[PDB]
Amino acid sequence: ELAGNAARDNKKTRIIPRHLQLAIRNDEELNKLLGRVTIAQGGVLPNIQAVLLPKKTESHHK
Amino acid sequence: ELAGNAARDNKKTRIIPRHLQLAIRNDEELNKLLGRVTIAQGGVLPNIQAVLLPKKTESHHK
Amino acid sequence: RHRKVLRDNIQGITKPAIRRLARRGGVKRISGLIYEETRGVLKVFLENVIRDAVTYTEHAKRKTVTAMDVVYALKRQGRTLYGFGG
Amino acid sequence: VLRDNIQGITKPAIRRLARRGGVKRISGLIYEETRGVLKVFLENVIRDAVTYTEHAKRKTVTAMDVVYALKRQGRTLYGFGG
Amino acid sequence: RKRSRKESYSIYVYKVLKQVHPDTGISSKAMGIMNSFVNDIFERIAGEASRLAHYNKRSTITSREIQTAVRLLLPGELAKHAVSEGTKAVTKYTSAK
Amino acid sequence: RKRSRKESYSIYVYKVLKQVHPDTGISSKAMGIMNSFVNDIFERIAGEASRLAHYNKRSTITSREIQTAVRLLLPGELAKHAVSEGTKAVTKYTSAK
Amino acid sequence: VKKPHRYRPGTVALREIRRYQKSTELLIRKLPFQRLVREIAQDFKTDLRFQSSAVMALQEACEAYLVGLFEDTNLCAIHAKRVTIMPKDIQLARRIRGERA
Amino acid sequence: VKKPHRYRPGTVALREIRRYQKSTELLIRKLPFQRLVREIAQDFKTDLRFQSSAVMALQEACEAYLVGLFEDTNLCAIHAKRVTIMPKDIQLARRIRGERA
DNA sequence: ATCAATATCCACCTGCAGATTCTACCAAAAGTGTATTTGGAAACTGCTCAATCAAAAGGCATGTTCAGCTGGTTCAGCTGAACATGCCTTTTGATGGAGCAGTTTCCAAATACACTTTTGGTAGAATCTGCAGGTGGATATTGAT
DNA sequence: ATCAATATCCACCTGCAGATTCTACCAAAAGTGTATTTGGAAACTGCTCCATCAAAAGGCATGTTCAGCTGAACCAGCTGAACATGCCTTTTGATGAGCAGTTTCCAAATACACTTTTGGTAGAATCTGCAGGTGGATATTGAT
Structure with a gap:
């Protein structure tokens, strides 16, 4: 179910493993179940810590 | 055997759990086997990180 | 009067006891905010283990929690305990 | 010329992996340490794998041996059978 | 000819997928993933059931033991809903013999 | 009278302790520790052997399987020495029937 | 002597380190721990009873766990060129072990 | 236009982050990894052969492990008010997980 | 704010590697019946759990000090991301051609199982001695003038 | 640097809490013998794996260049250790039912032999979503 939801979100009609990883890591409980499990061809979630980006003061400064 | 050696080091003739813990953590391989095991009444090894002990310049300073 | 001893709860796990515990880990200097957080952490740990223990207890139709249940519940979390049977 | 073959794990590939891990800036010294760490992991796995391999009196390493050896180290793997 | x-x-x-999202497919690799997942959960639950039985000196694995193992392994609400489905299944199976 | x-x-x-250090005793708690330790290692090894057997569709656990599991679970030199003792034990047992 | 003898900050902590590391007795008192366990158990199932050795085993497990956690905490602290542990260190250690909560 | 267009340091790294995080293809080339596995396995037992899918499985495991490691390392780095990862960070994370070596 | 250069995202197309569906069929599921075992409701009983009051032991909440730790500021290096270039390890793709995974036979070795006969492991009653505790005296580690 | 303070080590002394040794006896372990598997040798085959060639080709080795980073002095202030005190919690010993742990026994539960279907699966025969391609609209970036 979660996979199909992500699938519709990316406009793809066929489930691929990427979707499964996206489903698992976005639900807390499943992530707990599979916290030490690697899904092949899965990758990880997009996530950058806020601190290492550049500051939002990137605009007119005069 | 390791326990009895530690025993002779502490001048006690009877093996107690403390000695077993001492034997286990001081042998690399046994520590690997039982890295996630808790020995009751075992305590831990004496170990202080060097950095939080005071500087050896604790003497005549004039 | 209001005692309820300090909360009638975890707050009986007094500060200097946590200090002694940190001393066992080789630590020298502790901040004032540590205590509460540690307590919460402790609770979570206990919660999980106790839950499992009670569940084992429930399977045997007993009303007494035995040591064995605690051992097994600890074993499933990868914190096997020796010296109390099993 | 070949270079002990660990150097096949090149700098830019490691940089790419670190990029997947959320890393933005990498020191020059990381590479050697990473290589060593990688080696250790592989060694352990393959040892166990080969052990399973040796038990069947086979000479061909199969995926299942790897999967099991991975399972026993607490890094269970999905997607290659069993 | 040997096979x-x-x-x-x-x-x-595949049946379940068509039940939940009729206009949707799935690739082979993901199907393999689901296969591995199922086998892993099966192994965990049965193993835990066995350990519970052996600890209480009972030689039969019944629905009770499975239910207990499920409450042990899975957290909270997932367990509750699953247990409910299982109880419903037992209740349907036992009646319509 | 029931017992x-x-x-x-x-x-x-106790026997082994008297063999390695004749002038030394051991308390009850530590003996319990050793008892639990033995039980744990026994369980791990048997389970691992079982898993190997089941993966190769062989229905018999033999010395070979135990040897394999030992090499898997324990590290290095400990494995080698223990394996030596095991092999010596089998060689003695099989001869002097 | 006029003024009270006074050790410098840190020394007595070190003394406590050596004294408690050399021994093994439990540091937390039985009774509060008993009451804590009893309360939490009451919230899951009612009128339960507990054998003493079970409480002792929980005590051992908890103290060992906390000791390990403070150890990793102290390492993380040393990593940041500090000597004072802080909550974020504990959070870091637990997050890395996967003991999320 | 006279001078070459030049992005500031860090931006292209971020571009690499988003691009590789969106996709899933393996990052390391097959053949070197095959040669690595073959060398190490030869030192344990001789003339071994490997199925392709086993090599792929090791590749997946290795990359996932490394990714996780770098994640914890980066957290450790941030904890020290730095942005650059260094070897002691990796040692710290690995020492905390128990992956001692 | 305002303007050039690339990077990312939408729109529209098209043919094929992978997905889905359609056969044949053969190793599992179900039924039936009968043999075997088992889990759970009654009868006991002996260890253990539940918690109060009084008297005493030891530790903790609090409040007073003050040494040195954190953490922000600023600054001198330094070193690691961008990006150009040229060449070269890898992709792909094909082909051969050896060797091993996996089947199928089969039978000499191995082991479960039903008894029978020994036997040592373990509860429980008599000894015992190492160590917890206690007394006293000598050296070690802190720290100040 | 040397002197007092205090903590801690170390020699010596005593009685008791587990440590240790001695009975009976019964569940447990070895022996015969038989019934029943079962795993390794031998004979075959076809799948998969391994050494080569070649044409790109995308990617890797190297070399510049500079904007951001990593530390290193310095200092305010804060915050948490040392210590004293009184007080408050905790400890520990007074000589009833509840529940863990057995023992019976049989009504329910379920293994095992055999036959009858039948759903699952390998392989042939269709489908098609989406990987590639092409083109154009913004969206970031970055200098000015």
Whole structure:
């Protein structure tokens, strides 16, 4: 179910493993179940810590 | 055997759990086997990180 | 009067006891905010283990929690305990 | 010329992996340490794998041996059978 | 002409997928993933059931033991809903013999 | 007058202790520790052997399987020495029937 | 002597380190721990009873766990060129072990 | 236009982050990894052969492990008010997980 | 704010590697019946759990000090991301051609199982001695003038 | 640097809490013999794996260049250790039912032999979503 939801979100009609990883890591409980499990061809979630980006003061400064 | 050696080091003739813990953590391989095991009444090894002990310049300073 | 001893709860796990515990880990200097957080952490740990223990207890139709249940519940979390049977 | 073959794990590939891990800036010294760490992991796995391999009196390493050896180290793997 | 036979849970997963999202497919690799997942959960639950039985000196694995193992392994609400489905299944099976 | 019977590995540990350090004793708690330790290692090894057997569709657990599991679970030199003792034990047992 | 003898900050902590590391007795008192366990158990199932050795085993497990956690905490602290542990260190250690909560 | 267009340091790294995080293809080339596995396995037992899918499985495991490691390392780095990862960070994370070596 | 250069995202197309569906069929599921075992409701009983009051032991909440730790500021290096270039390890793709995974036979070795006969492991009653505790005296580690 | 303070080590002394040794006896372990598997040798085959060639080709080795980073002095202030005190919690010993742990026994539960279907699966025969391609609209970036 979660996979199909992500699938519709990316406009793809066929489930691929990427979707499964996206489903698992976005639900807390499943992530707990599979916290030490690697899904092949899965990758990880997009996530950058806020601190290492550049500051939002990137605009007119005069 | 390791326990009895530690025993002779502490001048006690009877093996107690403390000695077993001492034997286990001081042998690399046994520590690997039982890295996630808790020995009751075992305590831990004496170990202080060097950095939080005071500087050896604790003497005549004039 | 209001005692309820300090909360009638975890707050009986007094500060200097946590200090002694940190001393066992080789630590020298502790901040004032540590205590509460540690307590919460402790609770979570206990919660999980106790839950499992009670569940084992429930399977045997007993009303007494035995040591064995605690051992097994600890074993499933990868914190096997020796010296109390099993 | 070949270079002990660990150097096949090149700098830019490691940089790419670190990029997947959320890393933005990498020191020059990381590479050697990473290589060593990688080696250790592989060694352990393959040892166990080969052990399973040796038990069947086979000479061909199969995926299942790897999967099991991975399972026993607490890094269970999905997607290659069993 | 010699030929083997490897079983899997593929077809049942396919049925479930069509039940939940009729206009949707799934690739082979993901089907393999689901196969591995199912086998892993099966192994965990049965192993835990066995350990519970052996600890209480009972030689039969019944629905009770499975239910207990489920409450042990899975957290909270997932367990509750699952247990409910299982109880419903037992209640339907036992009646309509 | 009713009385049960709980087995352990105590007496054997005591024998070994007297073999390695004649002038030394051991407390009850530590003997319990050793008892639990023995039980744990026994369980791990048997389970691992079982898993190997089941993966190769062989229905018999033999010395070979135990040897393999030992090499898997334990690290390095400990494995080699223990394996040596095991092989010596089998060679002695099989001869002097 | 006029003024009270006074050790410098840190020394007595070190003394406590050596004294408690050399021994093994439990540091937390039985009774509060008993009451804590009893309360939490009451919230899951009612009128339960507990054998003493079970409480002792929980005590051992908890103290060992906390000791390990403070150890990793102290390492993380040393990593940041500090000597004072802080909550974020504990959070870091637990997050890395996967003991999320 | 006279001078070459030049992005500031860090931006292209971020571009690499988003691009590789969106996709899933393996990052390391097959053949070197095959040669690595073959060398190490030869030192344990001789003339071994490997199925392709086993090599792929090791590749997946290795990359997932490394990714996780770098994640914890980065957290450790941030904890020290730095942005650059260094070897002691990796040692710290690995020492905390128990992956001692 | 305002303007050039690339990077990312939408729109529209098209043919094929992978997905889905359609056969044949053969190793599992179900039924039936009968043999075997087992889990759970009654009868006991002996260890253990539940918690109060009084008297005493030891530790903790609090409040007073003050040494040195954190953490922000600023600054001198330094070193690691961008990006150009040229060449070269890898992709792909094909082909051969050896060797091993996996089947199928089969039978000499191995082991479960039903008894029978020994036997040592373990509960429980008599000894015992190492160590917890206690007394006293000598050296070690802190720290100040 | 040397002197007092205090903590801690170390020699010596005593009685008791587990440590240790001695009975009976019964569940447990070895022996015969038989019934029943079962795993390794031998004979075959076809799948998969391994050494080569070649044409790109995308990617890797190297070399510049500079904007951001990593530390290193310095200092305010804060915050948490040392210590004293009184006080408050905790400890520990007074000589009833509840529940863990057995023992019976049989009504329910379920293994095992055999036959009858039948759903699952390998392989042939269709489908098609989406990987590639092409083209154009913004969206970031970055200098000015």
